[model samples]
Target chain A: SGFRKMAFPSGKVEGCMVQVTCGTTTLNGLWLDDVVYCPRHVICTSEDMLNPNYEDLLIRKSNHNFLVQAGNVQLRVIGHSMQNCVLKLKVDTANPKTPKYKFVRIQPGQTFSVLACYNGSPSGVYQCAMRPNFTIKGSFLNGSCGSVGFNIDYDCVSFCYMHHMELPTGVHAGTDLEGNFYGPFVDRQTAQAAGTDTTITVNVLAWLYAAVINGDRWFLNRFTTTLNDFNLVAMKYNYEPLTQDHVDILGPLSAQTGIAVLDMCASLKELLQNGMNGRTILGSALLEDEFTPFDVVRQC
Target chain B: SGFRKMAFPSGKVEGCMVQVTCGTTTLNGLWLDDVVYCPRHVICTSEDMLNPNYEDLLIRKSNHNFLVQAGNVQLRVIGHSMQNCVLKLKVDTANPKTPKYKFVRIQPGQTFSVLACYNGSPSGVYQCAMRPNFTIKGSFLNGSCGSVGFNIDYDCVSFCYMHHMELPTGVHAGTDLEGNFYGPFVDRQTAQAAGTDTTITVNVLAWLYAAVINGDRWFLNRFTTTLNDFNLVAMKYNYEPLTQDHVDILGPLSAQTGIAVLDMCASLKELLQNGMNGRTILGSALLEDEFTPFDVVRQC
Candidate 1:
C-alpha cells in the first residue's frame, strides 16, 4: 500500500521517463497523455498523412478533448447529443504499459462506471478508479490476447446507457455498484453541490449532464434528433469509438428500449427515494416515455 | 429624404406588417432578414428537403449567424479562415422591395467596404453602409435583371483580400473611398476605440477582426493552414456563399501571389500613414511576408 508519490512532471513534448503505481502495478510507456498522440516525424505532406483515411471514424473521449493523429490524419470531432453514438470504455490490463482490466479513471469525478469483464465476457466485478485530486500517472491497457481496434464515432458531445441493460446473457446489469450505471447520471459538481441526501450519491458517477440539459430541462425528442444542430439547441456533445467493437455496440445501443429521457428537475433515482413531480404528452405503446424521479440533483 | 421610421418588432413567426425605407426607395416583401429564407408551407419530408442537395454549397454570413434551411437541409457553416472561400456580395434589386444597389450594411459598423458596381462591373463609388446607432431599416439589393445565383463558399470565420489588387482592367481599385478595401480592416468596437483623426478611419470598415486575431497576434501560416483546426488555434470563423459566382473566385483565392501576411502590432494602413515597425527576416524572391504599423487598433 505504499503508493509513494514521485515527481514525474515534465514538458508535454519529450515525454521522458514517466511512472505511476496503480494498485500494486507499476507501468511505463513512451506516452503520458490522452486517447491518441503522434510523435514528430519527418515533414509529411498533407496528402502523405491523409493516406489511412477512415473518414467515418468517430473519436470520442472524456471532458478533455483529443486530436488523435496516427499518421498525418488528425481525427476531427463534431458536436452531437445522441446516446447510441457513444460508450464508456474503461481500458486496462494486468500487464505493465499494456492494460488488462481498464479501471477507467480517472479523475476524482471524470469517469463512467464499468464492470471488469473477463475473457471477453462479463465478470460482474467492479474495475472503476476514482483519482482523488490525483494525477493519472498511469498507462494505457488492453487484454492480453490483444483487444478490439476501432477509430469510429468520435462525437465529443453525446453519451448513451440503458436504465437496465439486458446483458449478452439477457438479464439486468450492475447490482454491486447499486446499478448506478443503469442509465441516468450527473456531473461531479452537480453531485457535490447536491449535498449528501439520498442513496444515489453512492452509486451515481456524476455525468456530463451539464452538456445535455437546458432550460433546466432535458428534452427527450431532442436527445435523439436536432440535438446535434448547434444553433437549434443549447447543449450538444461529440462521441468517439476507441475500438472497432463499439461500432457494433453503439448501433445496437439504440435498440435497448431506445429511451430518450426527459429527466426534468433532479435525479430519477433520487426522486424515486424522495417525492413527486409536463403536459401535451403523446407516445407509442412500445415505449414507457414518461417518468420523473431521482432527486440527487436538487436546489431552489 | 423624408425617411420615416416604423415599429415592426414581431414574433420570429407570424410574419405580419413589415416594411422599411432606404435611399428614396420603399421595399415590401414577406421577408425582413438574412441571405436565404424559407416560408412555412407543406410538411416537407426530411428527405423531401434533402433533395436539390447542393451538397458542396457553402452557406456563410455576417457575425449574425444563420440557419438557412432551404427545405430540410439547413445550411451548416463550418469554421474556416481562408480568404478565397468567401466574398462580400451585396444583393440588390432596385424595383420596389427589391434592390438595385446592395449598400452593404445599414449597422453603424457591421459591414465590410465594397464599391457599388455598374452592371457586373466595379464603380469607383462606394456601396459601403455604416448605420450609426441607426436601424438597418432597409432591404437587400441586387442589380437590375438579376444578380448572381448559387451558394458555394460559406466559411464564416475567415476573410480574404489584397493589399493592392490589379483589377480586371489592370489597375488597383477603390480609390474614391481612399482604398480601405485593399486589404487591412478593423471592427466597430476596435475602430471606435481607435479614436479619430486619420484618413484611414474614414475609408475603413471596422471589420470582424476579433475573430481572426488571438494572443494579441495573428499568424500568417496558421491563417492559411491550421486555422480551420479549431483545437489547434484560437480565433476561428465560418464563411458562406450566396451566389454561384464565388465558387470560381474562392478556388483561386490563394493565388495573386497567394500572400499570407504577418501584420503585427497594429493596422497596416494606419502604421503606414503613421511611422514604422520584426525578425526571423526571410522571404523568397516573390512576396513581402512581414510589415506592421496600423495605429487604428492600438492601446496600452
Candidate 2:
C-alpha cells in the first residue's frame, strides 16, 4: 500500500516512520500528526517524552477514552485507521429518553472530542456508545475493532445499592470495584440472569418500596436513614461527591447519625413518599417482581 | 417631651432632631441616627432632596422591609418606635416547617436586618409572618401594629392553577392575579383553607398523572409536552426562572414537535401509576374530595 501522506489541519508534521503500537496491534511507518486537534484528549506529548526523538507522536489511539474531570464528562474518538475514516457516536440512557448523536469524518491521523458539563439532579445517569467505520487493503487485526459503551452516573442525594457477584468472592460488603461506569449490569444478559457478572442497583426510592413491600428491615432502616442523610448533606451543606467512594460515605454517616440524619428524615420521607407517588414511574422496573431486591448493608 | 439623647453604635447624630414624622404620627425630639445600619432597607436618600440640608435617609419607614435580591431574601426592621424599644421579629413559614427567629434590642433609633437566601427547589412556596412583640407605656397603634405576612413563591416547572372568585365576571375560567414572588396565595387562612390552597401544582411525574387521569386534552397535550421541555431546558440549558410568568412559557413551547413530550409522558404515566401503588400515601390528601380538579386551559 502506498503512503497516504495525510495532511493535518494544523502545524507541519515532521516525524520518522515510528512503529505505533496501539493496544496489541503494531502498525509501522505511521507518522504522528503534530497538530493539536483537541488539547484535552492529547494524553502524551513528545515534549514530555524522556527521549524527545520519537517525532512528536500520539502513541495511543483515542478509541474509547472517557473522563469525568472537574465536573465535566468527556468522550474522545481518534481516527486510528490509515484509510479515510468515519466515526459514529450516540449517547443515550437506560432511564430517560435523552439521546444525543454526533457524526464525524476525520483524516487518517486526527481526533475528535465531545464534552458535556454535569448539571441537573445527581439522580440522573447516562449511557454513551461509539463505533468506528473504515476500510483498508491489507488484513487487519481479527474481527472488527468493536464498539465501546460508557455509563455516566450522577450522584443523587438518595440511597444507592450497588449489587454484584463477579467481585473476587469474599469481597467486603461495600466493596467499590470501579464499576462499569455504565450501570450495575454490563449488558442485557447480565441484567437478566445472575451469571458470573450479574449486577444490579436499587436506588433510594426503590429501596423504600422494597422496604415496605418485602418488609426488608435492613434496607428499610439503612436505606431510609441513608437517604435522609444524603439529602440533608447534599442540600443543606451543598456537599455533593464527584466519585463513588465519597458517595459510599453518605450512607454510613447517615446510619450512624454522623451527619444531621435525624429530624430531617421523617419530613423528607413523607415528602418523598408522596412525591414519588407522582414519580414512581421512574423506578417501575426496579419495583417489578422479576427484578431482585437488594440490601445496602448486606451487599445483596 | 424631652429629647431622648439616643446612643447609637457609631458617629455623631448631627441633624436638628428632625422631628421623625413616621406615617401620620410625628414624634418630637427624636433624632435620626447617622449610622447607615442596613443598606438593603434604605429606599430613599437626601441626595434626591431639593436641598442637601436634610440628613440622608430612607423616606420609607424601615418598618417591615422585605427583599429578594442577589439570591438573598432579606428582611430589615428599623426601630420605628420612639420608645427605648425591643424589636422582636420572628419569621415562620406555613409550608415545610422551617422557622427562623431574630430578636434585636434597638435603642429607640437603630435598625436590624435578617437575611435568608432563596434555597431549595423553586417550586416551594413560603408564607412568613413577622409579628412585633414589646409592651409600651401608653396606647400603641391600632391592632398591635398588625402582624406582617408576606408570600414568597419559588417558580416551579409545573402546572399551577390560581383559583379565585376574582375571575372576570361571567367568565368560568382561570384568573391570573399577579401572585406573590413564590406562588399564588399569601395569607395564612387562605393557605390553610381547602386544607391547602384552592391551589393545585402538577410536578414532573404529577404532570404525567394529570396527562392521563383527567385526560383533559389541554393538560394531556400541554403537560406531556411542557414537561419534556422543562427537563430538556432545565438540563441542557440550565435556564431556570424565579417567577411564575417565565415558568408559564415552558408548556407552550413543549407543545410543538420541538421537543419529544408524547412518548416520555406515556412511559412516566405507566410507571407512576404502578410505582405509586405503594406510595399513594403522599397524594392521599390530593386524591381526597377536598382538592377540586383544575383544568390546564380553561383554568377551572
Candidate 3:
C-alpha cells in the first residue's frame, strides 16, 4: 500500500526510453547506497483474455536478414477494437491446423497487411518464417482520421472496401461516423445483435484472391507473437458510432434495393454445373468470429 | 608487511578489519556512526579518441539530400585487431567556415581508414577531425580487436587527392641484384651529403608531392595503417633485396636497349606508381621508415 520495489538483474537492460510519463509529470530516479531506484505508481491490470499477436510482426525492410517475398499478395492485421493492450483474437480459418499464414505482431487496434502484387504477378503469399527475427520490446498507439504506417506491397492496389456487415439487416454497407460513434448499444443483448453492434463497413473496388494466395512460400510462413503488457481497454477505433446509428435505423427503413441473390442462385444452375463438388451452407453465427467473404461487383 | 590488516565496507552501517595470515576481522561502531574512509582501486583510463557522427551523414541513394557530386564521399573505420568492446563513432561536420569532414576517434592501437577509391580519379586534400564517442565503462582489457565497426565513404578519396604525377622505368631491362645494399637516409639532405654512402635506388612507382599550390592540393584522405601498437613505430618498408637487385641492373640496361620512353615506362614504371593515384610517384619516405609499397608478387 505504501511503496513497493522490484530489482532487475544487471544483465536485463535494453531499449531507448525517451520519455516515461504518468499523466503530465515526468518520473525520475534516485541513486543511494550503490543502487539506483526509480519510483512510480503501479497501475493494476485486469484479467487475462485471449488476444491476437501484434508486436513483432512487421520486420523493418532494412533488417540484417531482409527477405521479402517475390509475389504481389500482401498480408496484415486489421484491428477492430483492441489496441496497445493484448487480447485474444480469433485466428479465423476453416482449418485451424493450417491458418493461411500470420504476421505475429503490429500496433494494436488497427490493421496491418501488405499492398503489392510482386515480381510480374499481381498478388500471393510469401514463403519464409520471419517470426523469429524480431526484437520483442516496444509500444504503439492507435487513433482515427489518419493512418500511422503503410501496407505497401510490390504491386498496386486495384480496389479496396471497408464496411460493417454485422448489422441487424445483415449488411456491410452503412453510415460513417466519427470516433466509431456506432457503439454504446445500450445493453449487452442489443449489442450482441448486428443492428446495435459496432462495425466498420467497407467495399472493394476489386479483389484478386488468386494473387493473394500465390505470392511466395516465404510470405506464407507462420506469423509470430510475444507477450505484451499494455493497457488497451480505452482504445477507440473505426465503426463504433456508425453501428450505434444503425441500431436507431434498424427499427425503421422504408426502402429496398432491387436485387435478389437467392433468385440468382436458383437460376444459375447451368453455368455453375462443374462435375461433383460439395457446397457449403453457413449460418450468421458462423461469420461472427471469422473472416467472411463478400460478393462481387457487377456493372449495370 | 608482517601481518596485514585491512578494513572493508561490510554493509550500509559497518566496517570490518581483519588480519590476513590468521587473525579475526573486527566490526567497528565508529564506522557506523560516521562515514568510513578507505582507498580503493577503481580504474585507470585514457579518454577514447574514436568519435563518429551517430545521427546524420547517412543518405539514401535516392534521397533529394543525397549529394552525388563527382568527388563527394563518405569515410569509414576498420580495426584489424579485436572486438570485445562496444564503440560508438559519431560525426561532427556542421561548420561552413573551415574545410572539414567526419573522422573516427581511434583507440591507442586500433587502425581504421576509408577503403576504396571514390572517383575513378584519386587525388585531393580532405581534412577530418576525430574525437571520442563513447567508452566501455567497465572493460579493462589489454588487447581486444574490434574489426570493421563502421562503414566509410570511399568516394571521399577523390575529393581529398588533388595532384597526380608520373615516372617511368623499363620492364625486361632490370637485372638481379649484382649490387650492395644502401644506408638509411631521413631526407634529401641526408641522401645527397653522405660522402661514403653508396646506395642502390629505384624510381618511386608513384608521384609524391606536398603542396596545395600549382593547383596541386591533396590530403592523405584514403589510407591504411597496421594493427599492433608497435607496427606504427616500425613502419619500415624499404625495397626488398630482390627488388634492389632488379633496380640496379635494369636501370643502366634500359638506357642501352633503345626502348621507347613510354613503352618501357608502361610496365616497369608500375613498381614506382602510388596505388592511390596510378600516375603519381610513390613518395612515402621508405628510406626513413624502411617501409616499401606493397609488392604485386614477392618471390625471388
TM-scores (chain A) of the candidates: 0.17, 0.20, 0.17
True contacts kept of 3: 0.00
lDDT of 2 by residue, A67-167 (tens): 21111322233333221111122222121211231222222111111111111101111111111111111101101111111111121111111111122
- Tens-place lDDT digits, model 3, residues B107-197: 2111121111112111100111111111110000100111011112322111111111010110000000111111221101111222221
Looking at candidate 3, what is the lDDT of residue B251? 39
Candidate scoring better on lDDT of 1 and 3: 1
- Worst 10-residue lDDT window for candidate 1 chain B reads B1-10
**RMSDs, each prediction?**
29.0, 23.8, 33.9
Each prediction's TM-score against the native?
Answer: 0.15, 0.22, 0.14
Q: Could you give me the TM-score of model 2 versus the true structure?
A: 0.22
lDDT per residue, candidate 2, B174-292, as tens digits?
Answer: 11112211222222212211111111122233233333332223222334434544445333322221134324433543453233434434443443344334333222212211111
| Candidate 1 ranges beyond 4 A from true positions | A1-167, A170-281, A287-300, B1-300
RMSD of model 1 against the true structure: 29.0
Best by lDDT: 2
The interface root-mean-square deviation of each model, in the order shown, is 34.9, 38.1, 36.3
Model 1: interface root-mean-square deviation in Å: 34.9
Give the Å error, residue B299, model 3: 68
Candidate 3 lDDT over A1-300, as tens digits, reads 000000110100101001112232222211111121121110111121112122333222112121111122211212112222211111111211121211222211222211111111211111010111111101011110011112212222111111111223222121111112122211011223322322222110011111122121111112221111000110132222222232222221111222122221121222123311222111010001111112111000
